[PDB]
Amino acid sequence: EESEKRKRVSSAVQFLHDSRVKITPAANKIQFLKSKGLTTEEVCEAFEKAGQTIPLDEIKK
Numbered sequence: 001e002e003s004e005k006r007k008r009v010s011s012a013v014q015f016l017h018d019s020r021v022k023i024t025p026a027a028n029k030i031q032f033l034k035s036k037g038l039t040t041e042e043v044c045e046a047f048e049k050a051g052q053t054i055p056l057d058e059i060k061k
């Protein structure tokens, strides 16, 4: 749980840093990360650690 959480968040951060990912809508990114088993908590953390505007309009909670 703990180790898999750390790894998910870290993978999400590198994901958000990908130049091809960055130019896509926030919605795409959230939905993909959710399909990757991240919690909304972890999604929010990833955006923070990646220094990217946490997408405020959060539909999928």
Ligand SMILES: CCN1C(=O)c2ccccc2Sc2cc(NC(=O)Cc3ccc(F)cc3)ccc21
Binding pocket: 008, 011, 012, 015, 018, 020, 021, 024, 028, 029, 032, 033, 036
């Ligand atoms: C091929 C480039 N790319 C996308 O275009 C893209 C853009 C928005 C949403 C999903 C995708 S699929 C995709 C995935 C990835 N990376 C992974 O699938 C690896 C990964 C990322 C986050 C995780 F939580 C687990 C594995 C990189 C670029 C990329």
